């Protein structure tokens, strides 16, 4: 039974090491969500600091890949940072060679191809992470593209990842069934973040303080993360209506 140890086919045509890498993805017990506005793309993620000895400012699963592209990761931090460093290197190399900023979907494809190689070559293991790339692309507009350990990737109107992804996914599905549009019809990114937090609260059934969340926002020509005080201002606005 060595077909379960390396990435070769089982008699059912399955790759068990890939399947087990998907399971490692939920080891952090963190849920993330991504949505698109008119002019922006918002990504939120749960933040858990279980040790009082930790410096909470260094605990993060959101990464600034390039000026335009952000990435949230679902999975252990070592594999997350491995993917983050590579994505940063790929994005920089792309700009140097081809003279324009690497698109979000193209970076997603590139990282998905790298992941595919780990499922075919025996000496390399899959990374136990799911990567959600976000940006406001200059051609395609607000963009969400997500990669997994199988080497699969696709664009999203909105998406969710983590142990309780299904609850968040169904909640988002029901909203877009009502509105009948592919995005949040809102002018400001502040209100799109408020939408994202509100619908995560509804789906998970939990309240959040300023330290329980982690937020990333993509606008035209920049991606940035919010501070605790910026998130607090968001939480106050939600509570006041």
């Amino acid at each position: 039974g060595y077909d379960r140890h390396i990435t070769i086919f089982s008699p059912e045509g399955r790759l068990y090491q890939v399947e087990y890498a998907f399971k490692a993805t939920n080891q952090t017990n963190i849920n993330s969500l991504a949505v698109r506005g008119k002019d922006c793309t918002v990504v939120i993620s749960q933040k858990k600091v279980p040790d009082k000895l930790l410096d909470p400012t260094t605990v993060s699963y959101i990464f600034c890949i390039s000026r335009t592209i952000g990435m949230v990761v679902n999975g252990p931090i070592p594999d997350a940072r491995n993917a983050a460093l590579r994505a940063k290197a790929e994005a920089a190399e792309f700009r140097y060679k081809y003279g324009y900023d690497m698109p979000c979907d193209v970076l997603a494809k590139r990282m998905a191809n790298l992941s595919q190689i780990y499922t075919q070559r025996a000496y390399m293991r899959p990374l136990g992470v799911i990567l959600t790339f976000v940006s406001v692309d200059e051609e395609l507009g607000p963009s969400i593209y997500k990669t997994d350990p199988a080497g699969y990737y696709v664009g999203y109107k909105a998406t969710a990842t983590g142990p309780k992804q299904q609850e968040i996914t169904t909640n988002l599905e029901n909203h877009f069934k009502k509105s009948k549009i592919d995005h949040i019809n809102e002018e400001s990114w502040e209100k799109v973040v408020e939408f994202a937090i509100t619908h995560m609260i509804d789906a998970l059934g939990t309240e959040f303080s300023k330290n329980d969340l982690e937020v990333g926002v993509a606008t035209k020509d920049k991606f940035f993360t919010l501070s605790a005080e910026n998130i607090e201002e968001r939480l106050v606005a939600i509570a006041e209506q």
Binding site: C64, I65, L85, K88, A92, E93
Partner: protein
């Protein structure tokens, strides 16, 4: 080519002419010699156009990758990356680069990297074929902690003289101002600076 960078109270300003020659023919009379390697780190190029463009592109790549990992690089760091490329490949390069940038901690800084690939931090720097004719003028007229308007006048007057005497220099005078307020481009035409 006539290029210079000058530190002042609020930051630093880069200046350049716009003439590019192939022998005595002016191949481009509206060249932009002020090149951006980072938001508030720019450089002036002299020597081989192919070499300095190649170097600048590589530096821009290095600083973009630096920023993604470690945040905004210092002007000293940018100068160091320029130097590494110029020094290690000195046999195959003809490049004279002035690096200028604005930090909030360090404010305006100027570094010059001549042919050999050495680095020199200076209050102001001049380079290019036309710089020879304004060593006297610049040394006599430069003061530390000048205002924005004074520094614009100093560069305008300096490059005006460099253009007047150097056949390899000419066209418009381009300038880029680097301060806390942001990045401002300036342009000055012949009819303005020739009558100074």
């Amino acid at each position: 080519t006539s290029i210079m960078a000058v530190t002042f109270k609020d930051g630093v300003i880069l200046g350049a002419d716009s003439r590019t020659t192939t022998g005595a023919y002016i191949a481009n009379r509206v060249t932009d010699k002020l090149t951006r390697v980072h938001d508030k780190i720019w450089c002036c190029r002299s020597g081989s156009a192919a070499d300095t463009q190649a170097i600048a592109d590589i530096v821009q790549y290095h600083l973009e990758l630096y920023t993604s990992q470690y945040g905004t690089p210092s002007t000293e760091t940018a100068a160091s990356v320029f130097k590494e490329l110029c020094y290690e490949n000195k046999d195959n390069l003809t490049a004279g680069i002035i690096v200028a940038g604005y930090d909030d901690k360090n404010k305006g800084e100027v570094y010059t990297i001549p042919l050999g690939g050495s680095v020199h931090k200076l209050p102001y720097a001049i380079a290019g074929s036309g710089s020879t004719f304004i060593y006297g003028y610049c040394d006599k007229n430069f003061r530390e902690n000048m205002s924005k308007e004074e520094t614009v006048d100093f560069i305008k007057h300096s490059l005006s003289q460099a253009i007047k005497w150097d056949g390899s220099s000419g066209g418009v005078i381009r300038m880029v101002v680097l301060t806390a307020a942001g990045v401002e481009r300036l342009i000055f035409y012949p009819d303005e600076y020739e009558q100074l």
